[PDB]
Amino acid sequence: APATGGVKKP
Amino acid sequence: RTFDLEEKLQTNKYNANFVTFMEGKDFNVEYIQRGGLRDPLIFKNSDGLGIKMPDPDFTVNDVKMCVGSRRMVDVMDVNTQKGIEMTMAQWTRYYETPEEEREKLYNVISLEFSHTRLENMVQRPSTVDFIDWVDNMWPRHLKESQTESTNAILEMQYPKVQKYCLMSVRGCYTDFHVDFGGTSVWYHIHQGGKVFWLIPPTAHNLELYENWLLSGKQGDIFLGDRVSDCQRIELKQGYTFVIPSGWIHAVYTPTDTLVFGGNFLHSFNIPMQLKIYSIEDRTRVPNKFRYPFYYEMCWYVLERYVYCITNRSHLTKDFQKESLSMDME
Amino acid sequence: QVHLTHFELEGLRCLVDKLESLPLHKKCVPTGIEDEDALIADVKILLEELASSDPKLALTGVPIVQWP
Ligand SMILES: [Fe+3]
C-alpha cells in the first residue's frame, strides 16, 4: 500500500 | 444519486455569464498582472497559446504504450464517486469495450504522465510556465532529480501535478469540487467534449460548498441549484479551458473524450489558494487527494521573492551552491 | 524600487501571516530553508518598503521571480 499524492478526485 | 442529471443538462437556468473568450496572443504575463487570473477563460483555437498536442487520432492504447502497460492508474466509479485502481492495460481494455457492453461507468481524471514518453508530447500554454510556482519557486535540482513516473509520495521530489491525461467515456459525471490546493487549471479537449457547471468562489458559495461536503448528501443535492449564479458551458474539441482558483465546478461527458490538462499555483491569488487549503483541512480530505508539499512550496515562494528583490538568500549554503551550479549551465 | 501588483502585495501578506502562525508540527519548513524566522522578518520589511508600489509601473509584462 504505497502512499501517493496529487490525486484528482471529488 | 437522487437528482436528475438529465434535466440539469437541458435547463437554461444556468445562464450566468462568467467565462471570457480570448485570443491566445492576449494571454500573456501582463494580462495576469492586470487581472490576477480571476476570470474563467476559453480559447476556441490554439493560436498564440504555444501548446503542443499528440496526433488528433491519438488513442487510449497509445496512452498505455507511452506510460507503460503495467502503470497503475486511479479510476473513478461514477455512480459512487469513489476511487478504485487498475493497470493501464486493464483500463485500455475497458475503454475499448463497446459502449453498450460496459458493465459500469468509469472515469480516469488523475493520470499524471510526467517523466514518461507522453511527457514531451504535451506542452502547457507558454504563459503558465512563467507563473507556475513549480517552475519558478521549487529548487531546480530537486525537480530535475525526479525519476518516478507515478505519484508515489516517497519518491516524489516536487509537486508532481503539472501534466494530467483524462480519459472519459460517454456518460461520465464528476460532481462539484474545487481542485486541490486551490490550484488553477488549464484544460485542453484533445478529442470529444465536456460540459461544465461553474460556480464563483464567493464567500457565501465557499461556505455553501463546505457545508455541502460536511453534509455528506452530495449525491442528493445538485450544488448548482442552490446558488444564485451558475453557468453551464459546453467545451468542444480543440478548446482550451482555464479555471481560476477556488471555482466550484462539476463536469459531464456527453461522448468518449480525451483530455490533457494540469494544475498550478501562482502568486496572483495566494489568499484564495490558502482559503481552499483550509477548507480541505476542515473537511478532512485525505492527503492523497491534496497538493503535495503545499507548505514547503509556500516557504520556497517567500525565499524567491526576498532574494529576487533584495538579493538576500535564505536558503542553506548547500542549496545556494546547487542553484549556482545550475546557473553556470 | 521594484513595483509589485496589489495582487502580489496582498498575497505575500497572507502567506507570511499564515506560515508564521503555523505550529511547529504543521509548519513544514522545507529542507532548503536555513532561518525561517529571519526569512519571515525580511518579508515584512520587504512588504513595508513595497507598500506604495505604483500599479501602472507594476504592469511590466515580466515576472519578478525568474531564474538567472
Ligand atoms: Fe476539477
Side-chain angles (χ1 to χ4, degrees), chain B residues 261-274:
Chain B
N263 301 72
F264 64 89
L265 297 170
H266 57 84
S267 305
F268 297 95
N269 201 14
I270 303 174
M272 176 61 60
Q273 293 183 162
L274 293 174

PDB file of all heavy atoms in Angstrom, chain B residues 261-274:
ATOM      1  N   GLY B 261      -4.511  18.112 -19.475  1.00  0.00           N
ATOM      2  CA  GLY B 261      -4.558  19.306 -18.653  1.00  0.00           C
ATOM      3  C   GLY B 261      -3.624  19.232 -17.466  1.00  0.00           C
ATOM      4  O   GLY B 261      -2.890  18.258 -17.300  1.00  0.00           O
ATOM      5  N   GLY B 262      -3.652  20.267 -16.633  1.00  0.00           N
ATOM      6  CA  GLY B 262      -2.795  20.319 -15.465  1.00  0.00           C
ATOM      7  C   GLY B 262      -3.187  21.413 -14.491  1.00  0.00           C
ATOM      8  O   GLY B 262      -3.980  22.300 -14.813  1.00  0.00           O
ATOM      9  N   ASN B 263      -2.625  21.343 -13.290  1.00  0.00           N
ATOM     10  CA  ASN B 263      -2.869  22.341 -12.261  1.00  0.00           C
ATOM     11  C   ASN B 263      -1.610  23.147 -11.971  1.00  0.00           C
ATOM     12  O   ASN B 263      -0.507  22.755 -12.360  1.00  0.00           O
ATOM     13  CB  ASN B 263      -3.372  21.675 -10.980  1.00  0.00           C
ATOM     14  CG  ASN B 263      -4.659  20.903 -11.192  1.00  0.00           C
ATOM     15  OD1 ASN B 263      -4.665  19.845 -11.823  1.00  0.00           O
ATOM     16  ND2 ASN B 263      -5.757  21.426 -10.662  1.00  0.00           N
ATOM     17  N   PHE B 264      -1.774  24.274 -11.290  1.00  0.00           N
ATOM     18  CA  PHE B 264      -0.629  25.103 -10.937  1.00  0.00           C
ATOM     19  C   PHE B 264      -0.991  26.177  -9.918  1.00  0.00           C
ATOM     20  O   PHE B 264      -2.118  26.674  -9.891  1.00  0.00           O
ATOM     21  CB  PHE B 264      -0.033  25.752 -12.191  1.00  0.00           C
ATOM     22  CG  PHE B 264      -0.961  26.709 -12.885  1.00  0.00           C
ATOM     23  CD1 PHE B 264      -0.982  28.051 -12.540  1.00  0.00           C
ATOM     24  CD2 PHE B 264      -1.806  26.269 -13.889  1.00  0.00           C
ATOM     25  CE1 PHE B 264      -1.833  28.934 -13.180  1.00  0.00           C
ATOM     26  CE2 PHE B 264      -2.659  27.145 -14.533  1.00  0.00           C
ATOM     27  CZ  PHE B 264      -2.672  28.480 -14.178  1.00  0.00           C
ATOM     28  N   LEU B 265      -0.022  26.514  -9.074  1.00  0.00           N
ATOM     29  CA  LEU B 265      -0.157  27.615  -8.131  1.00  0.00           C
ATOM     30  C   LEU B 265       0.592  28.828  -8.663  1.00  0.00           C
ATOM     31  O   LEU B 265       1.641  28.688  -9.292  1.00  0.00           O
ATOM     32  CB  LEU B 265       0.380  27.222  -6.755  1.00  0.00           C
ATOM     33  CG  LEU B 265      -0.332  26.082  -6.025  1.00  0.00           C
ATOM     34  CD1 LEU B 265       0.468  25.655  -4.803  1.00  0.00           C
ATOM     35  CD2 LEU B 265      -1.747  26.489  -5.633  1.00  0.00           C
ATOM     36  N   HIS B 266       0.050  30.016  -8.417  1.00  0.00           N
ATOM     37  CA  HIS B 266       0.702  31.243  -8.858  1.00  0.00           C
ATOM     38  C   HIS B 266       0.634  32.322  -7.778  1.00  0.00           C
ATOM     39  O   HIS B 266      -0.014  32.139  -6.746  1.00  0.00           O
ATOM     40  CB  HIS B 266       0.076  31.741 -10.164  1.00  0.00           C
ATOM     41  CG  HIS B 266      -1.398  31.976 -10.079  1.00  0.00           C
ATOM     42  ND1 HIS B 266      -1.938  33.151  -9.599  1.00  0.00           N
ATOM     43  CD2 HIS B 266      -2.449  31.191 -10.417  1.00  0.00           C
ATOM     44  CE1 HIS B 266      -3.256  33.079  -9.645  1.00  0.00           C
ATOM     45  NE2 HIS B 266      -3.592  31.900 -10.136  1.00  0.00           N
ATOM     46  N   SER B 267       1.307  33.442  -8.019  1.00  0.00           N
ATOM     47  CA  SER B 267       1.481  34.470  -6.997  1.00  0.00           C
ATOM     48  C   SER B 267       0.416  35.559  -7.047  1.00  0.00           C
ATOM     49  O   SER B 267       0.508  36.556  -6.329  1.00  0.00           O
ATOM     50  CB  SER B 267       2.862  35.114  -7.132  1.00  0.00           C
ATOM     51  OG  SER B 267       3.891  34.142  -7.087  1.00  0.00           O
ATOM     52  N   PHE B 268      -0.594  35.371  -7.888  1.00  0.00           N
ATOM     53  CA  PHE B 268      -1.562  36.429  -8.142  1.00  0.00           C
ATOM     54  C   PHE B 268      -2.932  36.151  -7.534  1.00  0.00           C
ATOM     55  O   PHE B 268      -3.888  36.888  -7.773  1.00  0.00           O
ATOM     56  CB  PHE B 268      -1.689  36.662  -9.646  1.00  0.00           C
ATOM     57  CG  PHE B 268      -0.416  37.128 -10.287  1.00  0.00           C
ATOM     58  CD1 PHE B 268       0.443  36.225 -10.890  1.00  0.00           C
ATOM     59  CD2 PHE B 268      -0.072  38.470 -10.276  1.00  0.00           C
ATOM     60  CE1 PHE B 268       1.617  36.654 -11.478  1.00  0.00           C
ATOM     61  CE2 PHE B 268       1.102  38.904 -10.862  1.00  0.00           C
ATOM     62  CZ  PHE B 268       1.946  37.994 -11.464  1.00  0.00           C
ATOM     63  N   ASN B 269      -3.023  35.088  -6.744  1.00  0.00           N
ATOM     64  CA  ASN B 269      -4.226  34.831  -5.966  1.00  0.00           C
ATOM     65  C   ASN B 269      -3.938  33.862  -4.828  1.00  0.00           C
ATOM     66  O   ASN B 269      -4.635  32.864  -4.643  1.00  0.00           O
ATOM     67  CB  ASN B 269      -5.348  34.298  -6.853  1.00  0.00           C
ATOM     68  CG  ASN B 269      -6.717  34.504  -6.236  1.00  0.00           C
ATOM     69  OD1 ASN B 269      -6.870  35.265  -5.281  1.00  0.00           O
ATOM     70  ND2 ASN B 269      -7.721  33.830  -6.782  1.00  0.00           N
ATOM     71  N   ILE B 270      -2.898  34.181  -4.070  1.00  0.00           N
ATOM     72  CA  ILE B 270      -2.480  33.389  -2.922  1.00  0.00           C
ATOM     73  C   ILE B 270      -3.566  33.250  -1.849  1.00  0.00           C
ATOM     74  O   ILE B 270      -3.756  32.162  -1.307  1.00  0.00           O
ATOM     75  CB  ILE B 270      -1.214  33.993  -2.278  1.00  0.00           C
ATOM     76  CG1 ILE B 270      -0.090  34.086  -3.311  1.00  0.00           C
ATOM     77  CG2 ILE B 270      -0.774  33.170  -1.078  1.00  0.00           C
ATOM     78  CD1 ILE B 270       1.145  34.805  -2.810  1.00  0.00           C
ATOM     79  N   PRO B 271      -4.275  34.349  -1.529  1.00  0.00           N
ATOM     80  CA  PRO B 271      -5.314  34.272  -0.491  1.00  0.00           C
ATOM     81  C   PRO B 271      -6.362  33.188  -0.753  1.00  0.00           C
ATOM     82  O   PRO B 271      -6.670  32.409   0.151  1.00  0.00           O
ATOM     83  CB  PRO B 271      -5.950  35.664  -0.536  1.00  0.00           C
ATOM     84  CG  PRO B 271      -4.845  36.551  -0.989  1.00  0.00           C
ATOM     85  CD  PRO B 271      -4.067  35.735  -1.989  1.00  0.00           C
ATOM     86  N   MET B 272      -6.894  33.142  -1.971  1.00  0.00           N
ATOM     87  CA  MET B 272      -7.878  32.132  -2.347  1.00  0.00           C
ATOM     88  C   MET B 272      -7.282  30.728  -2.300  1.00  0.00           C
ATOM     89  O   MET B 272      -7.964  29.763  -1.954  1.00  0.00           O
ATOM     90  CB  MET B 272      -8.431  32.417  -3.743  1.00  0.00           C
ATOM     91  CG  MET B 272      -9.400  31.363  -4.250  1.00  0.00           C
ATOM     92  SD  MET B 272     -10.869  31.203  -3.215  1.00  0.00           S
ATOM     93  CE  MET B 272     -11.554  32.853  -3.340  1.00  0.00           C
ATOM     94  N   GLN B 273      -6.006  30.622  -2.656  1.00  0.00           N
ATOM     95  CA  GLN B 273      -5.309  29.342  -2.622  1.00  0.00           C
ATOM     96  C   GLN B 273      -5.193  28.835  -1.190  1.00  0.00           C
ATOM     97  O   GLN B 273      -5.318  27.637  -0.930  1.00  0.00           O
ATOM     98  CB  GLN B 273      -3.926  29.466  -3.261  1.00  0.00           C
ATOM     99  CG  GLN B 273      -3.965  29.729  -4.756  1.00  0.00           C
ATOM    100  CD  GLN B 273      -2.586  29.774  -5.379  1.00  0.00           C
ATOM    101  OE1 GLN B 273      -2.438  29.643  -6.595  1.00  0.00           O
ATOM    102  NE2 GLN B 273      -1.567  29.960  -4.549  1.00  0.00           N
ATOM    103  N   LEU B 274      -4.959  29.760  -0.263  1.00  0.00           N
ATOM    104  CA  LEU B 274      -4.907  29.432   1.155  1.00  0.00           C
ATOM    105  C   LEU B 274      -6.306  29.141   1.691  1.00  0.00           C
ATOM    106  O   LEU B 274      -6.476  28.301   2.575  1.00  0.00           O
ATOM    107  CB  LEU B 274      -4.256  30.567   1.949  1.00  0.00           C
ATOM    108  CG  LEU B 274      -2.767  30.813   1.694  1.00  0.00           C
ATOM    109  CD1 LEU B 274      -2.294  32.058   2.428  1.00  0.00           C
ATOM    110  CD2 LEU B 274      -1.948  29.602   2.112  1.00  0.00           C
TER     111      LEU B 274
END
